[PDB]
């Protein structure tokens, strides 16, 4: 009885073009703790990645956050997650709303 | 349950904890005096096996004896007149459970100590007819250390009902330093009980005095820890 | 006057990926990690500097020994569960203990065990009992309930020690725990018809309430809510969404304060 994770991509600050900011990927509600998480810049992995420590939820689930410092430009497009509950690594796009 | 000890000045004293559980990981020690607030003196840690003191106390003033299965003990050194009081052990099972405690009195001069004399006075004929109750009076006189425990025993059993003892004694000499004391107690029972000659009443004063280690150099007998007593019988 | 919660979590997995350890225990004061112990290091160490500043090393030594013993017990318990369920491969075993002080005044204590993420056994401190979800869990319930002294110890820990631990922890890290940072509220306009977004950001206490109302009259549950997420600097953020000429106002309640933005 495993539940698929929930992906959430957003920005740390109101995303204005040409400004230093942090892109945040928040994954929660996955029962197995072995996951693969990557951040995408123009469909390519960002290697200057940073993350918090793996945490616990009272409903026996887990949550984590990945982040990095960058500068948003409208040309660039911005999470890739792979899990045992996932047939394929699913991708989420950034809405910038 | 509360224990009691009388000691001279400059000697060392031993105190035993009276707690539900003999051995505790952290055991605290508090002192109480009539005027001041209770204050924590120190606490013993079994894991580090060391005492932790508070500010303003010498490190070589108190220490601890930790038996494997027995209640832990606290030992005091260089007793000063200001060390008199009542000491309680404490632990933290659900709240701070203080023990039965132990009273300690210390005296500078050991030639001023006298044991008490106990007398029992029978009820008045006027009271036995005016009222249906009878009152026996116990008087303990001529004891210098205010470290006594008074009890009443009827028919060989200690009685807790209908007995009153004033909480503090009075000075036999009100103006003299290191003056002897006097204490009074009262027992009231039904007149039917007193008129039966079969009934035996006894007033017992446990006097806390010198120990066997102390040395006596006076013409009088040794004021040792003793039990003084007086007794009376029913009289129709 | 806010809901604070101390928790300790233990997790184990059978035949894991060699990168993943076998047993891990982590504590939480306000859902941010406070401590960490794992089978690889076999040592309990803080994960917050202020807690390490105000604690003696012997505490870490004692709890490292205790967590070694608890790791061994956790492994044997998971093996027994796999034996009973006839399950082979890799499965998970989790335990969560702790207490909460609520903002309404009530206090709670809990201790639960779960197998493969599903509830297995829950403690009842008032009944001093165990609620089991299965006959396999009934066996463990019968075995554990025999030891009355251990159950009394757990109940008294949850009702007298966990609360005290929270009381000292909230003062050791009062700057990082009792702090308050107000949120910044902004209104955004923007598929033919679009709604106006009300957004708050930069508040440390995650407790936040957001409503839309027109001239003192709220909307009947047409406000499409948005999830609350952390910024990463120690703050959070949230957003909400609600032609005719009507005046609307956004009301937002944070710790102690109600603030309204008008259009």
């Amino acid at each position: 009885i495993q539940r698929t994770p929930k992906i959430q991509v957003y920005s740390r600050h109101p995303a204005e073009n040409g400004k230093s900011n942090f892109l945040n990927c928040y994954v929660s509600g996955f029962h197995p703790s072995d996951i693969e998480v990557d951040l995408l810049k123009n469909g390519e992995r960002i290697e200057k990645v940073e993350h918090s420590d793996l945490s616990f939820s009272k409903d026996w689930s887990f949550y984590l956050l990945y982040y990095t410092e960058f500068t948003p430009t409208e040309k660039d497009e911005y999470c890739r997650v792979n899990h045992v509950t996932l047939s394929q690594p699913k991708i989420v796009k950034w809405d910038r709303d | 349950r509360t224990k009691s000890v009388t000691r001279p000045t400059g000697s060392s004293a031993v105190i035993t904890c009276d707690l539900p559980v003999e051995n505790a990981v952290y055991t605290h020690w508090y002192l109480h005096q009539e005027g001041k607030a209770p204050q924590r003196l120190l606490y013993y840690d079994s894991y580090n096996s060391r005492v932790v003191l508070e500010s303003g106390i010498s490190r070589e003033k108190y220490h601890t004896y930790a038996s494997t299965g027995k209640s832990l003990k606290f030992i005091l050194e260089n007793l000063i007149e200001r060390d008199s009081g009542v000491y309680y052990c404490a632990t933290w099972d659900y709240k701070k459970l203080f023990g039965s405690g132990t009273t300690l009195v210390v005296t500078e001069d050991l030639k001023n100590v006298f044991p008490p004399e106990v007398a029992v006075f029978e009820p008045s004929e006027a009271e036995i007819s005016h009222t249906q109750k009878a009152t026996l009076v116990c008087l303990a006189t001529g004891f210098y250390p205010d470290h006594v425990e008074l009890s009443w025993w009827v028919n060989g059993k200690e009685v807790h009902s209908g007995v009153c003892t004033d909480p503090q004694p009075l000075k036999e000499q009100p103006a003299l330093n290191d003056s002897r004391y006097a204490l009074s107690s009262r027992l009231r029972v039904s007149a039917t009980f007193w008129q039966n000659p079969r009934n035996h009443f006894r007033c017992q004063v446990q006097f806390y005095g010198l120990s066997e280690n102390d040395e006596w150099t006076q013409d009088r007998a040794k004021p040792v820890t003793q039990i003084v007593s007086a007794e009376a019988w029913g009289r129709a | 006057m806010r809901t604070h919660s101390l928790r300790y979590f233990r997790l184990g997995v059978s035949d894991p990926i060699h990168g993943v350890p076998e047993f891990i225990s982590v504590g939480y004061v306000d859902s941010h990690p406070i401590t960490t112990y794992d089978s690889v290091t076999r040592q309990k160490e803080p994960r917050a500097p202020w807690m390490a500043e105000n604690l003696a090393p012997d505490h870490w030594e004692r709890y490292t020994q205790l967590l070694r013993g608890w790791q061994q017990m956790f492994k044997v318990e998971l093996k027994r569960l796999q034996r009973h369920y006839n399950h082979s491969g890799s499965h998970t075993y989790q335990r969560m203990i702790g207490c909460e002080l609520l903002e309404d005044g009530s206090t709670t204590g809990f201790l639960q065990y779960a197998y493969d993420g599903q509830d297995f056994l829950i403690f009842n401190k008032d009944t001093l009992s165990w609620l089991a979800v299965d006959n396999v869990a009934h066996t463990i319930k019968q075995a554990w309930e025999a030891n009355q002294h251990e159950l009394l110890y757990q109940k008294n820990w949850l009702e007298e020690e966990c609360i005290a631990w929270l009381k000292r922890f909230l003062e050791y890290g009062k700057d990082t725990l009792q702090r308050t940072e107000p949120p910044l509220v902004r209104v955004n306009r923007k598929p033919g018809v679009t709604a106006l977004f009300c957004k708050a950001h930069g508040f440390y206490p995650p407790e936040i309430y957001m409503t839309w109302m027109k001239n003192g009259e709220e909307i009947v549950q047409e406000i499409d809510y948005g999830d609350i997420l952390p910024s990463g600097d120690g703050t959070y953020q949230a957003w909400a969404s609600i032609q005719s000429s009507n005046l609307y106002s956004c009301h937002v309640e944070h710790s102690g304060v109600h603030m309204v933005l008008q259009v």
Binding site: - | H28, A119, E127, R188 | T107
Partner: protein, 211 residues
């Protein structure tokens, strides 16, 4: 963390009344742990009540007779006894708990204490002075008994005569409480009639003659 103060002075009250004990705490913590403890004349040290901002729990012996008013704004933790009984006369202290290490290693800080004396209600006073029989033959004993709680005892005029203070005794089988005072001396001109002449004697005091 620094100080706890008991403003109310020591008081003597009557049974069946309500009494309030005042206590103010100077703490740094946001949710401190406060306690009320009592010391009886038998020196028994027992936990009476515990309170925080949220909760309030008392001892088993209180039996609903004890309450606490904990008001945060005034920093006040007051003890309220709605039914008062003679089994409550004692010295009461209020304390705060300071955490420094393990919860078992904490410390309690107490106030200087308030002494409360619960005088009994004598429904049918029979103020009487008796001369006790000299058993075993060096003093003579005069006893004053069965007077209301309002009458107060004072010391003697002559230093050669010793007089004690009030004493409350409860006959448990008969559920009857009485007051008493003792007096003695050595001089041959000493009699029970003039024993308590220096105190406020009730007008209806029995002075029996030698039977």
């Amino acid at each position: 963390s620094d100080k706890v103060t008991q403003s109310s002075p020591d008081q003597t009250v009557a049974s069946g009344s309500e009494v309030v004990l005042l206590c103010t705490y100077d703490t740094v913590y946001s949710n401190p742990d406060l306690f009320w403890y009592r010391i009886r004349p038998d020196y028994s040290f027992q936990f009476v009540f515990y309170g925080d901002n949220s909760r309030s729990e008392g001892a088993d012996f209180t039996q609903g007779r004890f309450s606490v008013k904990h008001i945060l704004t005034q920093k006040a933790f007051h003890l309220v006894i709605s039914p008062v009984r003679t089994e409550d006369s004692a010295t009461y202290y209020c304390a705060t708990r300071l955490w420094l290490g393990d919860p078992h290693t904490d410390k309690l800080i107490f106030g200087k204490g308030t002494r409360v004396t619960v005088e009994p209600n004598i429904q049918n006073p029979d103020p009487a002075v008796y001369q006790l029989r000299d058993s075993k033959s060096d003093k003579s004993v005069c006893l004053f008994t069965d007077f209301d709680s309002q009458t107060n005892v004072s010391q003697s005029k002559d230093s050669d005569v010793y007089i004690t203070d009030k004493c409350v005794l409860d006959m448990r089988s008969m559920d009857f409480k009485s007051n008493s005072a003792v007096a003695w001396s050595n001089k041959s001109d000493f009699a029970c009639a003039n024993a308590f002449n220096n105190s406020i004697i009730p007008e209806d005091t029995f002075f029996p003659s030698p039977e």
